[PDB]
Homo-oligomer: A and B are copies of this chain.
């Protein structure tokens, strides 16, 4: 796919935030991967966001798209971003386990929840 390949080749928001407002980490040995999302929160919105993957990189395209979508959104709006709406925003995705498909959205939700704990 031109667009999915764009996100695999040139992923948006890869990295770490050193003092993050919220941090989520999820992984699953069936998917061969762990991933982390870091958020900074300003006002009531996602002011900055970064992700990184460890292991298999098959979740990179979805993670890049989800993080772009979450940037600038209210926490409440970002909590509503799902794999299914990221899937539509990539115009689908190749065959994979649903658990593997959900990693990025699950890490994003974890990071938001982490912030809320504070």
Copies in the complex: 2
Segment of A69-77, A95-103, A108-116 engaged in the interface with chain B: A95-103
- Of the four ranges (under 10, 10 to 19, 20 to 34, 35 or more), the interface on chain A belongs to 20 to 34
A45 CB, min distance to chain B CBs, angstroms: 30
- Known contacts A56-B55, A57-B55; A27 and B94 CB within 8 A of each other: yes
- Among A27, A31, A93, the most chain B Cβ lie within 10 Å of the Cβ of A31
Chain B residues near A33: list those with CB within 8 A.
31, 56-58
- Select from chain B the residue with minimum beta-carbon distance to A93: B32
- Known contacts A8-B54, A54-B8; A29 and B96 CB within 8 A of each other: yes
In Å, the complex CA distance between A19 and B34 comes to 35
Q: With A27-B94, A33-B58 given, can you name 12 additional A-B contacts, CB distance below 8 Å? A: A29-B96, A30-B97, A31-B58, A31-B59, A31-B96, A31-B97, A32-B58, A34-B94, A54-B58, A55-B58, A56-B56, A56-B57
Report which A residues bind B (CB closer than 8 A).
Answer: 8, 27-34, 54-61, 93-97, 100-101
